[PDB]
Scaffold this motif. Sequence first.
Motif, mmCIF file in Angstrom:
data_model
loop_
_atom_site.group_PDB
_atom_site.id
_atom_site.type_symbol
_atom_site.label_atom_id
_atom_site.label_comp_id
_atom_site.label_asym_id
_atom_site.label_seq_id
_atom_site.Cartn_x
_atom_site.Cartn_y
_atom_site.Cartn_z
ATOM 1 N N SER A 4 0.554 -1.307 0.018
ATOM 2 C CA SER A 4 -0.095 -0.238 0.176
ATOM 3 C C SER A 4 0.841 1.663 -0.350
ATOM 4 O O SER A 4 1.610 1.054 0.642
ATOM 5 C CB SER A 4 -0.675 -0.360 1.017
ATOM 6 O OG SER A 4 -1.456 -1.043 1.428
ATOM 7 N N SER B 4 -3.435 -3.247 -1.774
ATOM 8 C CA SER B 4 -4.592 -1.941 -1.543
ATOM 9 C C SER B 4 -3.908 -0.893 -1.903
ATOM 10 O O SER B 4 -2.500 -0.841 -0.929
ATOM 11 C CB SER B 4 -5.743 -2.142 0.163
ATOM 12 O OG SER B 4 -6.464 -3.272 -0.566
ATOM 13 N N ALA B 5 -4.015 -0.236 -1.890
ATOM 14 C CA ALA B 5 -3.914 2.030 -1.795
ATOM 15 C C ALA B 5 -3.623 1.831 -0.151
ATOM 16 O O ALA B 5 -2.286 2.500 0.532
ATOM 17 N N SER C 1 -7.623 -4.531 1.777
ATOM 18 C CA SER C 1 -7.058 -5.800 1.799
ATOM 19 C C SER C 1 -7.343 -6.466 1.101
ATOM 20 O O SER C 1 -7.507 -6.049 0.054
ATOM 21 C CB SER C 1 -7.786 -6.453 3.359
ATOM 22 O OG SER C 1 -8.837 -6.594 3.372
ATOM 23 N N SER C 4 -8.504 -5.326 -3.103
ATOM 24 C CA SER C 4 -9.604 -4.300 -2.585
ATOM 25 C C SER C 4 -8.620 -2.864 -2.853
ATOM 26 O O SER C 4 -7.253 -2.638 -2.710
ATOM 27 C CB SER C 4 -10.373 -4.098 -1.682
ATOM 28 O OG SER C 4 -11.471 -4.911 -1.819
ATOM 29 N N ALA C 5 -9.415 -1.939 -3.181
ATOM 30 C CA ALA C 5 -8.413 -0.782 -3.541
ATOM 31 C C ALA C 5 -8.032 -0.183 -2.075
ATOM 32 O O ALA C 5 -7.050 0.101 -1.539
ATOM 33 N N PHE C 6 -9.118 -0.404 -0.654
ATOM 34 C CA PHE C 6 -8.839 -0.558 0.554
ATOM 35 C C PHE C 6 -10.121 -1.517 1.062
ATOM 36 O O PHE C 6 -10.605 -1.510 0.181
ATOM 37 C CB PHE C 6 -8.943 1.281 1.023
ATOM 38 C CG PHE C 6 -9.958 1.544 0.501
ATOM 39 C CD1 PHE C 6 -10.843 1.737 1.775
ATOM 40 C CD2 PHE C 6 -10.376 2.482 -0.751
ATOM 41 C CE1 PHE C 6 -12.873 2.132 1.013
ATOM 42 C CE2 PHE C 6 -11.734 3.073 -0.938
ATOM 43 C CZ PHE C 6 -12.037 3.203 -0.323
ATOM 44 N N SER D 1 -12.821 -6.297 0.056
ATOM 45 C CA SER D 1 -11.851 -7.890 0.740
ATOM 46 C C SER D 1 -11.941 -8.090 -0.893
ATOM 47 O O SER D 1 -12.792 -8.641 -1.443
ATOM 48 C CB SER D 1 -12.616 -8.911 1.667
ATOM 49 O OG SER D 1 -13.809 -8.747 1.335
ATOM 50 N N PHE D 6 -13.917 -2.952 -2.616
ATOM 51 C CA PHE D 6 -13.401 -2.551 -1.178
ATOM 52 C C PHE D 6 -14.515 -3.168 -0.435
ATOM 53 O O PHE D 6 -14.942 -3.624 -1.636
ATOM 54 C CB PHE D 6 -13.622 -1.062 0.029
ATOM 55 C CG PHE D 6 -14.695 -0.334 -1.094
ATOM 56 C CD1 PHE D 6 -15.519 0.248 -0.153
ATOM 57 C CD2 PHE D 6 -14.811 -0.154 -2.103
ATOM 58 C CE1 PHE D 6 -17.385 0.374 -0.369
ATOM 59 C CE2 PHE D 6 -16.171 0.684 -2.536
ATOM 60 C CZ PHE D 6 -17.672 0.855 -1.902
#
Lengths: 7, 7, 7, 7, 7
Positions: A4, B4-5, C1, C4-6, D1, D6
Amino acid sequence: SAFSAFA
Amino acid sequence: SAFSAFA
Amino acid sequence: SAFSAFA
Amino acid sequence: SAFSAFA
Amino acid sequence: SAFSAFA
């Protein structure tokens, strides 16, 4: 953390 | 975290 | 996680 | 996830 | 989660 931008 | 970012 | 993007 | 944007 | 955009 990990791949990240941050966190 | 992971791919992820962030989080 | 994961992939995903976040979260 | 998983494969999601996201969550 | 799974293949979804989210959830």
